[PDB]
Amino acid sequence: ASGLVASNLNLKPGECLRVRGEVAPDAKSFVLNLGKDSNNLCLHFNPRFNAHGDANTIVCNSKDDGAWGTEQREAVFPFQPGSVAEVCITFDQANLTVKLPDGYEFKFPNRLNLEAINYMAADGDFKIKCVAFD
Amino acid sequence: ASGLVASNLNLKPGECLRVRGEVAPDAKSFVLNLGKDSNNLCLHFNPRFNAHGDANTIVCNSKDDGAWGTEQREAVFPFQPGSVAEVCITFDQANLTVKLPDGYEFKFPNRLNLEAINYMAADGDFKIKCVAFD
Ligand SMILES: OC[C@H]1O[C@@H](O)[C@H](O)[C@@H](O)[C@H]1O
Ligand SMILES: OC[C@H]1O[C@@H](O)[C@H](O)[C@@H](O)[C@H]1O
Helix, strand or coil, rough: CCCCEEEEEEEEECCCEEEEEEECCCCCCCEEEEEECCEEEEEEEEEEECCCCCEEEEEEEEEEEECCCCCCCCCCCCCCCCCCEEEEEECCCCEEECCCCCCEEEEEECCCCCCCEEEEEECCCCEEEEEECC | CCEEEEECCECCCCCEEEEEEEEEECCCCCEEEEECCCEEEEEEEEEEEHHHHHHHEEEEEEEECCCCCCCCEECCCCCCCCEEEEEEEEEECCCEECCCCCCCCCECCCCCCCCCCCCECCCCCCEEEEEEEE
């Protein structure tokens, strides 16, 4: 009952991952994890409506062998409870580029130095409606 | 080398699962599996161009607690190596309905009596590019 989990993605540098989902009507936060596996994440994309002291804050972090890295926070929050939201994530050797619903873009360093993303997992108040790879 | 693997799909009866992927240019066949897990498949969708002694025939079968059931072969074959193909799948407790690229649709008995589909997997000859739930 958690969220969609996909493996063997083999997303190489330069490829874009497009994820469209539904934010729960009473969402507190949702997560989109990308990486090698559940313990090695190049991107922990975590928009928080109201959770852990954050109010409408997008928090991103890396996870190397189970250990969380230094969190990064964005200046915009183009997400609304009970509404469709789409995010596009591009993979590069140095950084991951994330484009939000409203077109805002930001980068998150590829700390684990992954050469390919093979794992994706969604969880929280986000019901995935479609995923596309390129 | 296998294809994409998705779990926690939570596909419910009546929902439409649209899968679009690229058929390898030198594929002798390809597989799209759906079910509870790798050992319990409500649908083993296997178009065969030239494999296992068959030619341009779509072979369907189920796998219950590891055991393969009786195969069913389809009447059409709207597939070709080295091209993009999309299939649309839905189900109820009695049957699964598979719609092909040519708009043709057939039914395959839901032998596992599944009330939800949580697992999907493609092999090395079918590269999934898009997955939708509607
Ligand atoms: O640094 C990332 C982590 O931050 C925590 O506050 C949160 O509870 C975890 O689920 C994870 O998001
Ligand atoms: O009916 C399903 C089965 O068909 C056989 O021909 C094949 O060798 C098995 O691996 C399995 O796919």
